[PDB]
Write a protein that binds this ligand. Structure first.
Ligand code: NAD
Ligand code: NAD
Ligand code: ODN
Ligand code: CL
Ligand code: CL
Ligand code: NA
Lengths: 306, 306
């Protein structure tokens, strides 16, 4: 079954502990070269990654004993699913562990857009006292549009309801009855755009969600709409977002994620009305601990099957 | 016996409208000199200010007909209360207009301390991608200590309850039964300090609250406590806070307010774990509008009482 598991990224110690409690041998090495990674995998049936380690077609094809790739996080962004499927390698992730940490960062970004706290801190640290520049907006009575009403979307909804925000949204798979149970009125996208003071995206990256916000959608928005992307780079068209920030059609944007990470185009990051993080949505001690446990349990469950 | 009211700062047109609906005469002039202000007040029993106009002892002593000074805001920093009291002039403020805007900024500051959003934005704008540096804290299950359970304290409590924070606190006049009704468990200060992951202050500035947080209180705190002051400068002893940040007893602080504004001592503002705003707690379009209305209504209520 599984003898040895490699951990190629920085995880909570509890990942290794649960695996070793399950009778598995564990190696833990970070910042390994592509050649280095291939070398340490020759003894291993299991590999556990975060987002740093790139499990490409070349790494999969070279790792002969590899049976399972485990990602302590959501999606499979840094894993070639096609390459793994062709080799019969099982790819597992932790869809629940990061939900609350991503929802909390999203809520923080909404508050930061309303009051420009990051820009105000930068101003203060430059020895400036700029009261007029940083006149902000009250969230109470404003409309938040939530695109994607899965794990994270519903947690954002209930938190921002406590601020007196009206929460509307769209999800092609979630019933209006389910969304109603967490206070989100579902509408067609065309009805959402004109109502929103704030828009936040919580969808996978799919053809249908690539530029879910674009020039066509910004044209339908309230002048001065504020937008959050703590989901995946590209869901908000970065070209369309910059054009909306330049016109003032968009009053501000908060971006945890970019089409390229780190972004080589700095136009959005450098914009005075853009707040950003280097993909910190899952970067809490609690989320890293829960994902480490979630992936370790999946590995042990595989042992029980084998 | 209010007949004529001067507005010496920039207010929403709704302030003048409510006053004129109440049968009062209104004059509206901004950026007036101290001599100029005294000249325009000779006909006026009422003066309405923001923060720009300085209602000093000299202006009060010179204004013969002046009976009431109204501030469209919570503080009265720019009014000499002693000088006004000696003359029998009533000083009025707007204790309700700013509550939600101050509560929202406080909640934003808590989220910013949990995930270092201002520092992460500064890092991104410096061309850096520092994922590991900005490992943060999940708010769910953490304890928030709220000192002052009046208008703002109770609004902070219900919002942060939606994040799954345990809300404890202290208020010398609010009964434990009343605080329980908005989800805040009242304990003696000595029992609060060791439990808190986060502490926020929502008290007036009094002798009893000057250094409410100090070396004695930080010594009783959990190592790595995070502190918010969106109330008044000096409630958190700035010397004691800097010492706690330097030792790591305090993992971070968010300051909207300072003992001197703008602060001449930059040690706190410049600290990597300190986020700050130039006193933006009441700086929303909605709060500024509501305070302008709230002060006008108080003037009209006085007219109705005579
Ligand atoms: N920033 C971070 O560090 C971080 C961490 C966790 C998750 N995420 C990302 O956040 C996103 C949401 O994660 P989740 O756990 O809530 O996922 P989920 O699968 O629980 O929910 C996603 C929802 O999006 C809906 N959806 C699909 N296409 C849509 C469309 N065209 N319009 C609207 N909704 C659509 C789906 O029906 C589903 O309900 C994902 O992209 C995930 O990878 C980012
Ligand atoms: N940052 C800003 O721009 C901004 C804007 C609005 C208000 N404020 C400030 O926020 C503070 C709170 O305002 P509010 O409207 O909630 O006031 P409030 O009068 O409604 O409530 C203050 C509470 O503090 C309590 N208190 C007094 N001494 C205390 C002590 N030793 N320990 C604990 N609690 C004590 C009082 O009993 C009272 O219930 C004030 O200092 C106000 O000036 C700041
Ligand atoms: C501009 C203000 C104003 O004149 C209002 C409000 O304070 C604000 C908008 C709406 C006005 C009222 C409510 O209170 C007012 O002070 C008053 O002028 C208006 C009355 C006549 C009381 C009722 C209609 C309107 O809602
Ligand atoms: Cl509720
Ligand atoms: Cl009591
Ligand atoms: Na994680």
């Amino acid at each position: 079954n599984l003898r040895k598991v490699l951990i190629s990224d920085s995880l909570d110690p509890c990942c290794r502990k649960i695996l070793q409690d399950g009778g598995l041998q564990v190696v833990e090495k970070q910042n390994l070269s592509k050649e280095e990674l291939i070398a340490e995998l020759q003894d291993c049936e299991g590999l556990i990654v975060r987002s740093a380690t790139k499990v490409t077609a070349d790494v999969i094809n070279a790792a002969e004993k590899l049976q399972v790739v485990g990602r302590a996080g959501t999606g499979v962004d840094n894993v070639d699913l096609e390459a793994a499927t062709r080799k019969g390698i099982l790819v597992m992730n932790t869809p629940n562990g990061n939900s609350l940490s991503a929802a909390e960062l999203t809520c923080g970004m909404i508050m930061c857009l309303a009051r420009q706290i990051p820009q105000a801190t930068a101003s203060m640290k430059d020895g400036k006292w700029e009261r007029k520049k940083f006149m902000g907006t009250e969230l109470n009575g404003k409309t938040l549009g939530i695109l994607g009403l899965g794990r994270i979307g519903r947690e954002v909804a209930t938190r921002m309801q406590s601020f007196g925000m009206k929460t509307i949204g769209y999800d092609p798979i979630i019933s209006p009855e389910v969304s109603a149970s967490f206070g989100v009125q579902q509408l067609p996208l065309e009805e959402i755009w004109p109502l929103c003071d704030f828009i936040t995206v919580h969808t996978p990256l799919l053809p249908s969600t690539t530029g879910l916000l674009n020039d066509n959608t910004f044209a339908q928005c309230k002048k001065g709409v504020r937008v959050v992307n703590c989901a995946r780079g590209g869901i908000v068209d970065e070209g369309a977002l910059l054009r909306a920030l330049q016109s003032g059609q968009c009053a501000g944007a908060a971006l945890d994620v970019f089409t390229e990470e780190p972004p080589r185009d700095r136009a959005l990051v450098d914009h005075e009305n853009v707040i950003s993080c280097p993909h910190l949505g899952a970067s809490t001690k609690e989320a890293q601990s829960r994902c480490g446990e979630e992936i370790a349990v999946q590995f042990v469950d595989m042992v029980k099957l084998e």
